[PDB]
């Protein structure tokens, strides 16, 4: 269902990473499969060639944590006016304190050891319930 429209109309975009994370751009291809693209270090930008109606989202390349692009989940390149590129401001969401806590705990404890942690069962599930693109694609649909 969620897939890029095969418009064939070029659209230039600036991917601008105003997050402190390494950014993984993900293009949803014509059959809805996520295609990973080269990464952007923190604070960097790239002028890229995409197309009108194509779908993109952005993640942390290491952890797959979700990121926002122009304040939302999905970015769809639009028509270029006066030959100016479309800006895609990639930023950190305001994570819930819980989700932030989970990120930091995931970054310190190998997935083998989550069960050794002295916490309630549902938090162990929350830790193992990694941010995952496939899961988010189902939701958005």
């Amino acid at each position: 269902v969620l897939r890029s429209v095969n418009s064939r109309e070029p659209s230039q975009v600036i991917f601008c990473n105003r997050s402190p994370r390494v950014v993984l751009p993900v293009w949803l291809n014509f059959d809805g499969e996520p295609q990973p693209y080269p990464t952007l270090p923190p604070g960097t930008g790239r002028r890229i060639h995409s197309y009108r109606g194509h779908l993109w989202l952005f993640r942390d390349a290491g952890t797959h944590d979700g990121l926002l692009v122009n304040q939302t989940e999905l970015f769809v390149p639009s028509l270029n006016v006066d030959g100016q590129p479309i800006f895609a401001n990639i930023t950190l969401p305001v994570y819930t304190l819980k989700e932030r806590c989970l990120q930091v705990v995931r970054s310190l404890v190998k997935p083998e050891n989550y069960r050794r942690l002295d916490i309630v069962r549902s938090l162990y599930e929350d830790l193992e319930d990694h941010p995952n693109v496939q899961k988010d694609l189902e939701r958005l649909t």
Binding site: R18, T96, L97, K98, R100, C101, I119, V120, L123, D126
Partner: protein, 86 residues
């Protein structure tokens, strides 16, 4: 308008009422002081800092910084966030 949040070790954190209502658990404990027998001061100070952070950066175009969490307090802060639903 303020409310008082009291840590397990007796520290009294005084924050805006609207900030503390970020937490559904705190709303329910209020509906204006709340005692937290399981949350020590080094965790509840951070919780209060998250309120300030959340309120300041929710719906804002100005670039958003990372909310910092020392490794030493992360496990306890997780448990507190799960309890407080925030």
């Amino acid at each position: 308008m303020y409310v008082k949040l009291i840590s397990s070790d007796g520290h009294e954190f005084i924050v805006k009422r609207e900030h503390a209502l970020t937490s559904g658990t705190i709303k329910a404990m209020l509906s204006n002081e709340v005692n937290f027998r399981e949350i020590p001061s080094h965790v509840l100070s951070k919780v209060c800092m998250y309120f300030t952070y959340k309120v300041r950066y929710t719906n804002s175009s100005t670039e958003i910084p990372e909310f910092p969490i020392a490794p030493e307090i992360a496990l306890e802060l997780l448990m507190a966030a799960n309890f407080l639903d925030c």
